[PDB]
């Protein structure tokens, strides 16, 4: 997630990349991606749902001696239009800022979840990735992604490789 | 052997504005504003409008001799002047 | 939806075509663009 995303990841928004002796690859984290999708979808729908439908509305004619009415009628229409334009644009700017902040939080949270499981069985790199202190096959890579990593199992191999 | 954490990117050129930053390129977006139109007068849900042609409303209802083609128009979806 | 400048075939909440309308129409708004982001910042690498 540091220095840009992965154009090689196509099955979600958030995910993992791994390298081991059995071959490297990418996979999406579906729980993170789907929760993010549902949150954002509800938000877009709320923006739409709170703006009502425009119903038939037409203008009015006024006489030569009804200029004061004509001007009030116009004032009312311009006033309401200026207010709704303001509200529509402001709501979009406010939500676009939150969307992007939401997404940055979600990727950072996956990193911390992995960091927490690995503890002393891997070296933190500093680029949003970890290097194992033990040999790790596809099954342990899946375990870390699942959130079921067995730390004690590899703690002996790690302390020996760490020195 | 490694595990890296990251996120999606693509070739989208869609941009949005936010309060702190303008013209931000994003991977996915929603257009909330319609700007196209069919520049013709259409029927509404199957019913044609009444076109008054060269006639004003006063012409139409008083029966200006030249608003003859409207004397047989009994119903409409909307009126166009 | 019919406006004086043409008919509208749309499900979006807003339009920038015309304030006068007959039918079930998007709200007229004085804006050129109104767009939400749903995805991620598009920064590859």
């Amino acid at each position: 997630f540091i220095e840009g995303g992965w154009t090689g990841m196509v099955d979600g928004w958030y995910g993992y990349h791994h390298q081991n002796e059995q071959g490297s690859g990418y996979a999406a984290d579906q729980k993170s991606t789907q929760n993010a999708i549902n949150g954002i979808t509800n938000k877009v729908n709320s923006v739409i749902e709170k703006m009502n439908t425009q119903f038939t509305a037409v203008g009015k004619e006024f006489n030569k001696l009804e200029r004061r009415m004509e001007n009030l009628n116009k004032k009312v229409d311009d006033g309401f239009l200026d207010i709704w334009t303001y509200n529509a644009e402001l709501l979009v700017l406010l939500e676009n800022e939150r969307t992007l902040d939401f997404h940055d939080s979600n990727v950072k949270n996956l990193y911390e979840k992995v960091k927490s499981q690995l503890k002393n069985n891997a070296k933190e790199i500093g680029n949003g990735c970890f290097e194992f202190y033990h040999k790790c096959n596809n099954e342990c890579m899946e375990s870390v992604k699942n959130g079921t990593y067995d730390y004690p199992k590899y703690s002996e191999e790690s302390k020996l490789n760490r020195e | 052997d490694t595990i890296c954490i990251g996120y999606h990117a693509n070739n989208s050129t869609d941009t949005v504005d936010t309060v702190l930053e303008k013209n931000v390129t994003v991977t996915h977006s929603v257009n909330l504003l319609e700007d196209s139109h069919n520049g013709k007068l259409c029927l509404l849900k199957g019913i044609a409008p009444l076109q008054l042609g060269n006639c004003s409303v006063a012409g139409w209802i008083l029966g200006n001799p030249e608003c003859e083609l409207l004397i047989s128009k009994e119903s409409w979806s909307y009126i166009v002047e | 939806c019919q406006t004086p400048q043409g008919a509208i075939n749309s499900s979006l909440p807003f339009q920038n075509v015309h304030p006068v309308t007959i039918g079930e129409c998007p709200k007229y708004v004085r804006s050129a663009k109104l767009r939400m982001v749903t995805g991620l910042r598009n920064i590859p690498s």
């Epitope: - | 700007d35 139109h37 013709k40 | 920038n16 804006s31 050129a32």
Partner: antibody, heavy 126, light 107 residues
């Protein structure tokens, strides 16, 4: 940048049909959703509007000339065209094509002509 | 058709002077009025877009305003390059019309 360029014979004989073409570049007449105009100026006179065509092929004309004027549009080549049947001396003019742009305003889109081309002078004679 | 009448048909003024060109519509056209500058031999240039706004690239010396029927084009500090015919255009109705034009001479 947006550029319009008119072209045609520059000389038509009486009772022939005049046909002019405008090539649009730096824009797209299949994507913008704008109206494309034709106007003319008779020497010594002010400007007269001829008509316009929209993206959907919807065409309108100046009612004084509607029986003679035909306007069309080919999106594949970004070209507009104008044809006037039964051409006479009165049709000597500089013909121009123009793009009609807009900004949403109170009361609806407020339209204007911004890109006007160069202008092609057509003489009617024999 | 909505008629546009410009006045005067011809105006002369010296460099640095102030030029006011007015236009009257036969019908209420609200804010739908454009102004154009035509140099001899060239297609007209857009100066004023909304009755009160300028087209980018137009010198700040140009301005204008107006209501329903009565509109004005003003040139402050007239320069030699402002020699042109000026036109009043309405964009409210479909049969678009231009006024007859005002010729602005310098000195």
């Amino acid at each position: 940048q947006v550029q319009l360029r008119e072209s045609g014979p520059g000389l038509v004989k009486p009772s022939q049909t005049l046909s002019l073409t405008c090539t649009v570049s730096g824009d797209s007449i299949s994507n913008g959703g704008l109206y494309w105009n034709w106007i003319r100026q008779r020497p010594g006179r002010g400007l007269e509007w001829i008509g316009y065509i929209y993206y959907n092929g919807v065409t309108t004309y100046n009612p004084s000339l509607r029986s003679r004027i035909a306007i069309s549009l080919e999106t594949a080549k970004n070209q507009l065209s104008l044809r006037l049947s039964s051409v006479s001396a009165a049709d000597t003019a500089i013909y121009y094509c123009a793009r009609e742009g807009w900004v949403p305003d109170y009361g609806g889109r407020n339209y204007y002509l911004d890109f006007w081309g160069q202008g092609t002078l057509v003489t009617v004679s024999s | 058709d909505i008629q546009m009448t410009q006045s005067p048909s011809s105006l002369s003024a010296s460099v640095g002077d102030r030029v006011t060109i007015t236009c009257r519509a036969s019908h209420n056209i609200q804010n739908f009025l454009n102004w154009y500058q035509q140099k001899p031999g060239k297609a007209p240039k857009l100066l004023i877009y909304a009755a009160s706004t300028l087209q980018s690239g137009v010198p700040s010396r140009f301005s204008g305003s107006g209501s329903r029927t009565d509109f004005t084009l003003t040139i402050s500090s007239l320069q030699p390059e402002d020699f042109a015919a000026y036109y009043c255009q309405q964009s409210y109705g479909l049969p678009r019309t231009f006024g007859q034009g005002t010729r602005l001479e310098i000195k």
